[PDB]
Amino acid sequence: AVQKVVVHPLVLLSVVDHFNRIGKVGNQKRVVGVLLGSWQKKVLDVSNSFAVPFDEDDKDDSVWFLDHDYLENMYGMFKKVNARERIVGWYHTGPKLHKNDIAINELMKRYCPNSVLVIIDVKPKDLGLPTEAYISVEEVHDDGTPTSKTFEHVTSEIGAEEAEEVGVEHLLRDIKDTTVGTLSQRITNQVHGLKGLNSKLLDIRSYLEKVATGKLPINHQIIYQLQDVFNLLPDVSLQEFVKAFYLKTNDQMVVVYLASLIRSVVALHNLINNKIANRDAEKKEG
Amino acid sequence: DVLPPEADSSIMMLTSDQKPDVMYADIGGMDIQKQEVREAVELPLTHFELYKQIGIDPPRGVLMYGPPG
Amino acid sequence: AVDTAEQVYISSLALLKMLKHGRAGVPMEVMGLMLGEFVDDYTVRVIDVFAMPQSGTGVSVEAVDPVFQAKMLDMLKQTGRPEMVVGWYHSHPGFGCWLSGVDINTQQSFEALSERAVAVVVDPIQSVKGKVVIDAFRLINANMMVLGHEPRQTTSNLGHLNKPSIQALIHGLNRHYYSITINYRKNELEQKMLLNLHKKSWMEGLTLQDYSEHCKHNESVVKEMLELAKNYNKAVEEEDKMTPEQLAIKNVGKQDPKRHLEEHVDVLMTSNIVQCLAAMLDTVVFK
Amino acid sequence: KQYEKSENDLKALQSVGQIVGEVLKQLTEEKFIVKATNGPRYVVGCRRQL
Ligand SMILES: [Zn+2]
């Protein structure tokens, strides 16, 4: 299977400019394109991407178009310029996935054996991490469903490359509060609490919503399973979890005595140098 | 910039397997000379702190010679 | 010759295509075409970049396959934006980026099709983090050396051109070449979502995950590097207490005597990492 | 065929001679340290398909 996918900034900007391509027709069009990459390992690599023609109307909303010939000749171009590069999958704009978002993979499984998708968001209202990626597997159920063919998410991030470092890290010039040390992580320390909160808000909204609508949706397998997983691991016990706190005292201990000893001595030594060069230049100046 | 230590010692230090495959008992009857080369080379390689306590000043370089063969 | 104001616009995708394709084929100068829109007299706006295919295994040699032109522009016609070609690019990967003889050779043949089709040079080597280095040029004739060459409207651009700059040979190639300013306009949507990516996606998914992993570090792995820290902060210290003694001994603060220093500040910052991630323990683990 | 072989020669006239050297050792994933046989040492890089 896949360990995780590694998305580079170039493909995300190659989605943003694609939305700028089709932003003039406006009327009813999602962004859909084709993903390029490199199957490196169990981890996955992504280098390039490009467009595709695609449309979808209102009545009988299963009307969808993937030009094979565009794929053939333009993949011939990209293979002609780079032989290291080959196809790994596809992408679209992804507000979410709708019902028709299986047929694209079910077309191009005959190109990549595991045709992986990428769900992004061109509108950065997402205070989470963009570039979601699914992969389609089968999980055939105890109820005797014949074949449930469900996309499943494998985790994702934004990777690094030496030239794209030069690119991105020059294109920002905007914000740098880090001074990387005890405080490059505290902004993200607000982020981890707040972005557990957003996900939990989605959780409670979903839980309240399943009782009202979906007719009896409630997830029927993975509600009671993973809910009891939740209800099996909030350890708040008090027998030796209290007794981790002399190890907490030990955590305090080392840093207290390192700070208290060496910080004062170094600052004092600098005071020595400052006051020597202060008075010995004072007697020569005045 | 500074470099890490490098710049081949004709390859470097034989690295894995370029041993001559000669054992101790293969040499016959060289007891004073084998023992002296041992105490001059192999012994200060390990028991370094005995020299600092006894006050021996173990040597730096050793020289062998003799007729060819 | 008769000049205008010197100004080149960009697209944000352009620079990335430039660096990627000029890096992936680095020791040979990689041909690439450039695509955009001639808006007016003095500004040129590149909006799209597609790279050219390579050929035989030799430096600086370049070609424009017209069936590649037809098919690529045809795909960009069935892509959302068809537009006009505006020039081309390659790299000068090992040097201070001047157009070579082959470059001016393809320029005098390419200039008969477009007037201000600007030749651009990316370099993925002489830029590290605070340089693009974007470097574009413009060819001069030889017929108009009877006439002058010097109207140069909006004078600031020329005096700006002479500062990013070095050589004896660029100084020898102020003839045949006069550059043109390049600047950058950024979508605040794109700026803010690149900020999302590179101030949020360097934090990882669900955002609790790696900070609770630091909490996993703080009771299993930290004590080993705490032992390393304590051994350093004994061994370095008993000889850096010789240091103010010898400051009193030698002089009032003269030149650097020898190797070592205090270096304790870095080890203390690692200890600060220890304490901050130990503070993370209560916050994450409880509730 | 004279024009063909001599046009192959015409295309081939633009090749460049290349320095012959030996590699001392590998510094990093991209930094390589070689020695030119006529003289000095250098610090070089590779291609992407090597
Ligand atoms: Zn060149």
Q: Shape of chain B from CA axes? A: extended
Shape of chain C: extended
Radius of gyration of chain C: 28 Å
Roughly how many Å apart are the termini of chain C? 73 Å
Order of helices and strands of chain C: EHEEHEHEEHHHHHHHH
Biggest sheet features of chain B: none
What is the number of helical segments of chain C per DSSP (H or I, 4+ residues)? 11
Give a list of the ligands: zinc ion
Sheet-strand content of chain C, in percent, reads: 5-15%
Tally of extended strands of chain B?
A: 0
Structural class of chain B: mainly alpha
The tally of helices of chain B reads: 2
Question: Oligomeric form of this entry?
Answer: part of a larger assembly
Helix content of chain C: 40-55%
Count of distinct strands of chain C: 6
By secondary-structure content and strand pairing, the structural class of chain C works out as alpha/beta
- The radius of gyration computed from the alpha-carbon positions of chain B, rounded to a whole number of angstroms, is 17 Å
What proportion of the residues of chain B is helical, as a percent range? Answer: 25-40%
State the end-to-end CA separation of chain B: 50 Å
Fold topology:
This is part of a larger assembly, with chains A (286 residues), B (69 residues), C (287 residues) and D (50 residues).
Chain A: E1 5-7, H1 9-21, E2 32-38, E3 44-50, H2 68-81, E4 86-92, H3 103-108, E5 134-138, E6 149-153, E7 156-158, H4 162-171, H5 186-212, H6 224-230, H7 245-285
Parallel strand pairs in A: 1-3, 1-7
Antiparallel strand pairs in A: 2-3, 2-4, 5-6
Chain B: H1 31-46, H2 48-54
Chain C: E1 7-9, H1 12-23, E2 32-37, E3 43-51, H2 66-78, E4 84-91, H3 101-110, E5 118-122, E6 136-137, H4 156-161, H5 169-172, H6 188-200, H7 209-217, H8 222-235, H9 237-240, H10 242-249, H11 264-285
Parallel strand pairs in C: 1-3, 4-5
Antiparallel strand pairs in C: 2-3, 2-4, 5-6
Helix pairs in contact in C: 7-11, 8-11
The complex binds zinc ion.
Family (chain D): Belongs to the AAA ATPase family.
Protein name (chain D): 26S proteasome regulatory subunit 10B
Subcellular location (chain D): Cytoplasm; Nucleus
